[PDB]
Amino acid sequence: KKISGGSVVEMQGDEMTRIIWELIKEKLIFPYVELDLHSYDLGIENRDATNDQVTKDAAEAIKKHNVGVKCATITPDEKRVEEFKLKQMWKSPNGTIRNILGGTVFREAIICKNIPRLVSGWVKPIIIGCHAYRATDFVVPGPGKVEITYTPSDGTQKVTYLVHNFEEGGGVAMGMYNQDKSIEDFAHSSFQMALSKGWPLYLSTKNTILKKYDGRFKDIFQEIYDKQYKSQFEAQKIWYEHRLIDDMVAQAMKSEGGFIWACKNYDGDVQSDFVAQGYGSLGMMTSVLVCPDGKTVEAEAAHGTVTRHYRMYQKGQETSTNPIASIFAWTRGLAHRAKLDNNKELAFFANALEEVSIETIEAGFMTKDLAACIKGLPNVQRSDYLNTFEFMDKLGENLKIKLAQA
Amino acid sequence: SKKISGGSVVEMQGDEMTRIIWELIKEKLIFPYVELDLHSYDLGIENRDATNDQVTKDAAEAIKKHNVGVKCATITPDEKRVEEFKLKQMWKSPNGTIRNILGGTVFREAIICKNIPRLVSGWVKPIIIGCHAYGDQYRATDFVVPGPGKVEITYTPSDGTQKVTYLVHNFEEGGGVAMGMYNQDKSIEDFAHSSFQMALSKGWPLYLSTKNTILKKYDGRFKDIFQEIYDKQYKSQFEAQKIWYEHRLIDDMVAQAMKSEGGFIWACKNYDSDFVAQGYGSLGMMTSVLVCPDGKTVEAEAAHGTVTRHYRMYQKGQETSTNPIASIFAWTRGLAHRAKLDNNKELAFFANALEEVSIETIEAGFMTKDLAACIKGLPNVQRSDYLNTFEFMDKLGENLKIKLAQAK
Ligand SMILES: NC(=O)C1=CN([C@@H]2O[C@H](COP(=O)(O)OP(=O)(O)OC[C@H]3O[C@@H](n4cnc5c(N)ncnc54)[C@H](OP(=O)(O)O)[C@@H]3O)[C@@H](O)[C@H]2O)C=CC1
Ligand SMILES: NC(=O)C1=CN([C@@H]2O[C@H](COP(=O)(O)OP(=O)(O)OC[C@H]3O[C@@H](n4cnc5c(N)ncnc54)[C@H](OP(=O)(O)O)[C@@H]3O)[C@@H](O)[C@H]2O)C=CC1
Ligand SMILES: Cc1cn(C(=O)c2c(-c3c(Cl)cc(Cl)cc3Cl)noc2C(C)(C)F)c2cccc(/C=C/C(=O)O)c12
Ligand SMILES: Cc1cn(C(=O)c2c(-c3c(Cl)cc(Cl)cc3Cl)noc2C(C)(C)F)c2cccc(/C=C/C(=O)O)c12
C-alpha cells in the first residue's frame, strides 16, 4: 500500500507551472503517497471568482497545518486585467501569504555533477535568505521641505529629521520602515537554518552608509546569536559573522560554498532570482519560507509560471520546461512534514525523489535549459535534451525503479 | 614637429601605487608622442590636507573650464587614514567633491582581452554601466524608532500654503528603524542627458533599469523624465545611428543583459555595486568616466583604488606587478575626448592606438600578475607567467613605438 503522508496544504497555480504541477502529482507523488490534502486553487480565474478569498484561506491553512507547497501564480498587472477581464488588480498571492505567515524566504540552487554553477569554485550548496516593498513614495511638486517625524505613542517629545530642502525645483521622496520584531524573526530563522543544515551563517549589510537602519540588523543579529545560539553553533563547529556587503561578495566568490547568507538589501537591488534567470539556472532554484517558530514552512519553486513557455504550448510548439524546482517544493514540504510527524517512510520518499531528480540529470537526461547551461544555447541540438513530457516520463520511470528497491 | 599637439588637459595626481604608475604612463607612453597644455593639480593626501582640501575644488573648477580631466586614484580618508597621516580633518572623498561640482554621471566599463574570460561567457561586445550617484542611499536620513509611535513623512512647499503628511508606519508594538530618501528632478534630468550623450558617443542602445513596479512614484519619475527628454531631444539622433532607448524593470534587465551579446549602455538606479569584478577577475581592467550633462565635459579615471597593498611592497623594495591598464585608459579616454572637441584627428588616432597596443600586448601573453591569475588561477602563477610593473610598462612602450611607426 501507499505511504501515509499526513496533513499538507497545496496551492494550485497558473499557466505552464499549473501543467507541470499536475504532472508532478499524478506521476511522482500520488502513486506513492496518500495525503490529507488541504488543497486550494490559486489559479487566476478562481482568485477572481472568490474575490481573492481563496488566497487568504490558503495562508490561514498553512499556518494551521504548518506545511504548504505552492505552485507559481499570476500576479495581475494592467495587461492581465485585460487578458482575464479581472474585477480588479488583485495583489500578489505571495505577498498576501508572506504577510500573513511572516518568516524568511530561503533560496537554494540544486546542484548536479554535470551542471556548472555560477562560480566554478563552489562545491557545497549556498542558501540565501534575503529580507526583501512596504514603502510610501510620492512626487515633490516643487521647492519645499520634506521631513520625516516620529511621534511617540506615550506622549513624549515628537522628533523631526530633515530629509531635504528642495531649494530649486522638485523631484521625489519616500519613507521606509522596519520593525525590530521583523528583524528578530529574520535573525531566528537564519540561525535555525544554519544549525538545521549545519553550515556557518553570514549576514551582509551596508551599515557604513545606513549606519542606523542597517546597524539595527547587525546589532539584533549579534545579540540573538550571542545569547541564544552561539553555544549551539560552536557545538556544531560552525559560526556566525557579520560582513559588509562589499566584502561578502568577494568572500563568497572565493569560497567553496557551504554557508547560509542572510542578506539585507534595498528594495531595488539585484536579486539572486534575476541572475539565476540570466545564467539559465532558475528552473533549478528552490525557495522555502521559514517562519521564526521553526514549525511552519511554505515551499515553492523560485521561478514564476513560465508564461513564455506556456504561450509556446498554446501555439502547438514543443516545450522543455524544467520541473525540478517545483519537484523540490514537494520534497521539501514533505520532508518537513516527515520531520514534524516523525514519519521515517515519508522522509525516505522525499530524499529518494530528490536523488532521482539529480541522478536523472547527471545521467544525461535533462530539459533544454540545463543543456544550454552546459554547452551554451547556440550549440544546443534537439538530441541534447528532452521535452517537458519526455522528461517527466523519465523521472517517473526512474522513481519507480528507485522505490522498487525497498 | 614629431609630437602631436594635444591641447588643454587638466591632470590630477594621486596617491600610493597609482601615483607611481601615473608618472610611468606619462613619461613612457604619453609625453614622448604628445605635447599638451597640461594643467596639473596634486590631489595626494599631503597636498589635500595641506590646502584644507582646496586643491580638489580648484582641480574640479579647472575641469569645468577646459572640459577634459584625467585623475589618478586618491585615498578617501577614514579613521585609520586620519591616524596614518595625522590629518587635520577626515576629508570628504575627492571623487564626490568633483562629482558634486561638475554633476553628471559615472560610467564604468571593463576592457576586454580575448584571453581574459568575462563575467558572462556569451558577452562579445563591451557593456557600459552608468548608475545614479546622487541622493538615494548615499544621501539618506535613517533613524532608530525606540518604541510604539507614528512615523510620518511630510512635504511643505516653500510658499508654505500647503502641508502634506504621509504615514510611513504606525509602530503598534515595539520599535524599529525608518528612513527618508529623496532625489531632485535636476539630478534625474542630468542623469538622462548624460546617458543619452553616452549612448550617442558609443553608438549603442540605451536601457534605463528601475524598480517602478514597487516605487511607482519614486522610480516612475526616472522613467518619465528619461522618456520625455529622449522624445524631445534625442530620438531623432538615436534613429540616425540605428540605435534606440528602452526602459526595463531591473528584474528583466539583469536577465536580458546576461543573455545578450553586449554592446549596450546600461543606465542604472542603484549605487548606495559593480564590485564583483574584485572577486571575479581584476579591477585593473575596469575604467570609469564622469560624463557631464552638457556632453562637452568629462573626467576619466581608473575605477580601482590606490592599491595600497602594492605600495607597501614597493616602499620596502620587493618587486610588484600592478596593472596599469585602467590608468592608461583614463588618459586615452580623456585624450579621445579632447580630440573630439578639437577635431584633432592625430590625437584621436594616438588615443585609439595606445588602447589597441595595451589590449594586444596582453592578448599576446605579456601581462601583470593579476591577469595571469585570472587565467591560471592565483595558486598556479609562476614568476614567469607575468611581467612586473616596470617590465610591463616597458613592453607597452616597445609595442607602442612599433604601432605608431606603421601609420605616421
Ligand atoms: N512565486 C510566484 O508565484 C511567482 C510568480 N511569477 C509570475 O510568473 C509569471 C511569468 O513571469 P516571468 O517574468 O516570466 O517569470 P518566470 O520565472 O516565470 O520567467 C520565466 C522565464 O525564465 C526562464 N525560466 C523560469 N523558470 C523556468 C523553468 N522551470 N524552466 C525553464 N526556464 C525557466 C525561462 O527563460 P527563457 O524564456 O529564456 O526560456 C522563462 O522565459 C508572471 O505572471 C509573474 O507574476 C513570477 C515570479 C514568482
Ligand atoms: N576612485 C578612487 O580614487 C578610489 C580610491 N580608493 C582608495 O584606494 C585605497 C585602497 O582601497 P582598496 O579597498 O584596497 O581598493 P583597491 O582597488 O586599491 O584595492 C583592492 C585590491 O584589488 C587588487 N587590485 C585592485 N586594483 C589593482 C591593480 N590595478 N593591479 C593589481 N591589483 C589590483 C589588489 O589586491 P590583491 O593584492 O589581492 O591583488 C588591491 O589591494 C583606499 O585609500 C581607498 O579609499 C578606493 C576606491 C576608488
Ligand atoms: C550564491 C548566489 C549568490 N547570488 C547573487 O545574486 C549574489 C552575488 C553574486 C555572486 Cl556571490 C557571484 C556572482 Cl558570479 C554574481 C553575484 Cl550577483 N552577490 O550577492 C548576491 C546576492 C544579491 C543574492 F546577495 C546568486 C545569484 C544567482 C544564483 C546563485 C547560485 C548559487 C549556486 O549555484 O549555488 C547565487
Ligand atoms: C555588465 C556588468 C554588470 N555588472 C553588475 O554588477 C550587475 C549585474 C550582474 C550581471 Cl549582468 C551579471 C552577473 Cl554574473 C552578476 C551581476 Cl551582479 N546585474 O546588474 C548589475 C548592475 C551593476 C547594473 F547593477 C557587472 C559587474 C562586473 C563586471 C561587469 C562586466 C564585465 C565585462 O563586460 O567583462 C558587469
Author numbering:
A (entry chain A): 3 to 134, 139 to 412
B (entry chain D): 2 to 273, 278 to 413
The authors write:
Various somatic mutations to the genes encoding for isocitrate dehydrogenase 1 (IDH1) and 2 (IDH2) lead to variants with substantially increased capacity to catalyse reduction of 2-OG to 2-hydroxyglutarate (2-HG). The most common IDH1 variants in cancer cells are R132H and R132C. However, ivosidenib resistance has emerged as a consequence of a second-site mutation that produces IDH1 R132C/S280F, with 5 cases having been reported to date. The results with isolated enzymes inform on the mechanism of S280F mediated resistance, which involves reduced inhibitor binding at the dimer-interface and alteration of kinetic properties, enabling enhanced 2-HG production relative to IDH1 R132C or R132H.
Potent representative inhibitors from each inhibitor series were selected for further studies (i.e. GSK864, IDH224, FT-2102, DS-1001B). Strikingly, non-denaturing MS studies showed that all these inhibitors can bind with a stoichiometry of 2 molecules to each IDH1 dimer. The inhibitor binding affinity (determined by non-denaturing MS) was generally lower for R132C/S280F and R132H/S280F than R132C and R132H, respectively although it is not altered for FT-2102. The most potent R132C/S280F inhibitor, DS-1001B, was also analysed in a solution assay (employing CPMG NMR) and was found to manifest tight binding to all the tested variants, with the lowest affinity for R132H/S280F (KD = 4.19 µM) compared to the other tested IDH1 variants. Consistent with results from non-denaturing MS, the structure reveals two DS-1001B molecules bound at the dimer-interface. Interestingly, the two DS-1001B molecules bind in a manner such that their trichlorophenyl rings are adjacent, an observation of interest with respect to future medicinal chemistry efforts aimed at improving inhibitor binding. The DS-1001B complex structure likely reflects an open or semi-open (inactive) conformation: the widths of the two active site clefts in the apparent homodimer formed by chain B and chain C as measured by distances between I76 and L250, are 17.7 Å (semi-open) and 20.2 Å (open; Supplementary Fig. 8b/c). As previously reported for the inactive conformation, α10 in both monomers is partly disordered and assumes a partial loop conformation, which potentially helps to accommodate inhibitor binding. Notably, by contrast with the structure of R132C/S280F without inhibitor, in the DS-1001B complexed structure, the S280F residues of the two monomers are not adjacent but 14.9 Å apart (closest C-atom).
